[PDB]
Design a protein around this ligand. Structure first.
Ligand SMILES: [Fe+3]
Ligand SMILES: [Fe+3]
Lengths: 174, 174
């Protein structure tokens, strides 16, 4: 055996449009391996977050968080988190527009409106409960990764396609 | 003073969102050079068509046509055409969906609804009048290149973002 980093599926793959299945058991060796592979893939690609369907695993698992990120240099530190079987609550009415990218949409960015604040709950990989209120970029990452679990990619959320394009044109300094 | 092929602007460049100005004088040395550069750029990139704003020239000039095209291998021959100051007439109600790409959106395809038939008129680079009715892929490429003159790129026309993604995933053989 030689370890191979897991590849990220690109938009157009029908697996990214499926609705992920819940994780039935926590703290299994296999789940610890999945989480390790997700962090390895996310870190190698300078991701802000990653959802398991993006590496072909149809499960409700998301990871996110960094101290600094050079694909999103304006983003503040976000707590490193493993969030399994998430439940989100959106807090209307305050929305914020922001530029988003996605490792499954390589080379692009677009403006997406997100809730300024969300509640999220779920479980870590050991089965411990998580229950938080998030705002700003933290809230944006959680919404973006949650969307992957319900088959949504951020171009589906864009309303203004004059603000969608290639990162090297939109953000040359990056 | 070596000739440099003109580069194709990528989506995100604000020049692609502008509304192109009409050509005021036909049959000038400058116009013949623009047309030559457009064909050079289009052919090198296997384009089905090209609009002057895509090479940074804010003028109402489109070119299109080929015997065969390897980015759209199912497309039939389309008459090679230079169309300046185009006037299009859309013919409702018959619409057709088809997979479109764009040299300004490298690496992607998406399903776009177009009129099955259009009328188009305008002038060639010598100032002679052109007036045709086009159907199918011929009508599709004329609509696609005309859109470039009014600041529209095909993701602005997509309504089903489950059918938008990377060419290498959607069409592996290409
Ligand atoms: Fe994503
Ligand atoms: Fe185009």
């Amino acid at each position: 055996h030689h370890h191979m980093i897991r590849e990220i599926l690109k938009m157009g793959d029908p697996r990214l449009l499926e609705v992920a299945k819940p994780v039935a058991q926590f703290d299994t060796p296999e789940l610890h391996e999945i989480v390790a592979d997700m962090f390895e893939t996310m870190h190698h690609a300078n991701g802000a977050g990653l959802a398991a369907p993006q590496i072909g695993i149809g499960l409700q698992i998301i990871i996110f968080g960094f101290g600094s990120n050079n694909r999103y240099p304006d983003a503040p530190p976000v707590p490193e988190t493993v969030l399994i079987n998430p439940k989100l609550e959106y807090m209307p009415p305050d929305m914020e527009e922001g530029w988003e990218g996605c490792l499954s949409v390589p080379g692009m960015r677009g403006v997406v409106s997100r809730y300024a604040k969300v509640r999220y709950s779920g479980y870590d990989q050991f089965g411990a409960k998580i229950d938080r209120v998030a705002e700003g970029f933290h809230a944006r990452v959680v919404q973006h990764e949650y969307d992957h679990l319900i088959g949504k990619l951020y171009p589906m959320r864009i309303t203004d396609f004059t603000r969608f394009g290639f990162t090297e044109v939109l953000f040359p300094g990056l």
